[PDB]
């Protein structure tokens, strides 16, 4: 379990992988774009120290499953996706480590499941978006954009230690 805040290359690496798999700029897709409604409430609020770990773990599960589809594998770069799956698995192992050990990670009430359910629902909206746009390139960029914006600020609890007021 990652108790001390020495260093972290997890999220850092994901920012690169998803950027390398990018096809075009978001401005080029100013048409088929919309807000997916990323719930920051069950991410940046309440959960701060390891409490969001179970959420992140199950969140990556959705990401992995979503990208591991035959659709995404043929839309993105299979070679880069390989690294994506590897890093995702690494992050999964890094996150569940605290869940396996007797650390206060799953001591939270039903609210811990609420965040997971919210994530699944949020991701489900993305599944419908892909179907509506018939898995078009512009749609993928928007999807990748949201997943990127959500995942980057997923570990935000251990990064945004600027304002304590």
């Amino acid at each position: 379990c990652d108790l001390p805040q020495t260093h972290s290359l997890g999220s850092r690496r994901t920012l690169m992988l998803l950027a390398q798999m990018r096809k075009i700029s978001l401005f080029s897709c100013l048409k088929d774009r919309h807000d997916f409604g990323f719930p920051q409430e069950e991410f940046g609020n309440q959960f701060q120290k390891a409490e969001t770990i179970p959420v992140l773990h199950e969140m990556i599960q959705q990401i992995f499953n979503l990208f591991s589809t035959k659709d995404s594998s043929a839309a993105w770069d299979e070679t880069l996706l390989d690294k994506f799956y590897t890093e995702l698995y690494q992050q999964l192992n890094d996150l569940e480590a605290c869940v396996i050990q007797g650390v206060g990670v799953t001591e939270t009430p039903l609210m811990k499941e609420d965040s997971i359910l919210a994530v699944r629902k949020y991701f489900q909206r993305i599944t419908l978006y892909l179907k509506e746009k018939k898995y078009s390139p512009c749609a993928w960029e928007v999807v990748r954009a949201e997943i990127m914006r959500s995942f980057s600020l997923s570990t935000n609890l251990q990064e945004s230690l600027r304002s304590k007021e």
Binding site: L9, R12, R13, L15, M16, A19, R22, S25, L26, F27, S28, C29, L30, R33, H34, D35, F38, V142, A145, E146, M148, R149, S152, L153, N156, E159, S160, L161, R162
Partner: protein, 212 residues
């Protein structure tokens, strides 16, 4: 003559330069026929390409560079850059790019010095006078050590070492070693090798006459 014709007009080359934690972006374009005398810069987050936020002062201006300070606060994302090349009364071209604040961060403007002693190197990088507690940047600084041809790199802890002058001492060397130091950073990978002007200092050359 190969590939497609060279478009010596629609260049749309974007370059970002970090001048003391200040994000300054510049647009580079060529003037094949029409010469645009005014440009407008807009930006937004990649999350949702809708809120096209225009930059004050950098709108329909004669400047080729835009200096930001608190506009780019989404360090945990990549601000999309769109260039509106206005030519008189009509827009000529518009291109879009993206830059991750946790991948590039082209640093170079900060002044750096390197004093050479009898057997050690006294590196002194002058960074902006800012308290780390007031900032939230995730990046590591690497000091390149080119000692008499030997290309080495030192990446120490920047936790409270960037707020002022970075004092680094390189030892385990021999006399007469001209060393070139470069100040660059690393993020997710070492692909952000923003090598600054490699200054070469020569410490006391012990190449004198060999006696008993």
């Amino acid at each position: 003559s190969y590939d497609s014709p060279d478009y010596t007009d629609e260049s749309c080359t974007f370059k970002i330069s970090l001048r003391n934690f200040r994000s300054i972006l510049s647009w580079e374009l060529k003037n094949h026929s029409i010469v645009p005398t005014h440009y407008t810069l807009l930006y937004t987050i990649m999350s949702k390409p809708e809120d096209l936020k225009v930059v004050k002062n950098c709108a329909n201006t004669t400047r080729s560079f835009c200096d930001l300070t608190d506009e780019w606060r989404s360090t945990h994302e990549a601000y999309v850059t769109v260039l509106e090349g206005f030519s008189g009364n009509t827009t000529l071209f518009s291109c879009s790019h993206n830059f991750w604040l946790a991948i590039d961060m082209s640093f170079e403007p900060p002044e750096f010095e390197i004093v050479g002693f009898t057997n050690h190197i006294n590196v002194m990088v002058k960074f902006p006078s800012i308290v780390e507690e007031e900032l939230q940047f995730d990046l590591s600084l690497v000091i390149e050590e080119q000692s008499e041809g030997i290309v080495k790199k030192h990446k120490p802890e920047i936790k409270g070492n960037m707020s002022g002058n970075f004092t680094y001492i390189i030892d385990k060397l021999i006399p007469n070693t001209n060393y070139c130091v470069s100040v660059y950073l690393e993020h997710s990978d070492e692909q952000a090798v923003i090598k600054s002007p490699l200054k070469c200092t020569l410490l006391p050359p012990g190449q004198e006459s060999e006696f008993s």
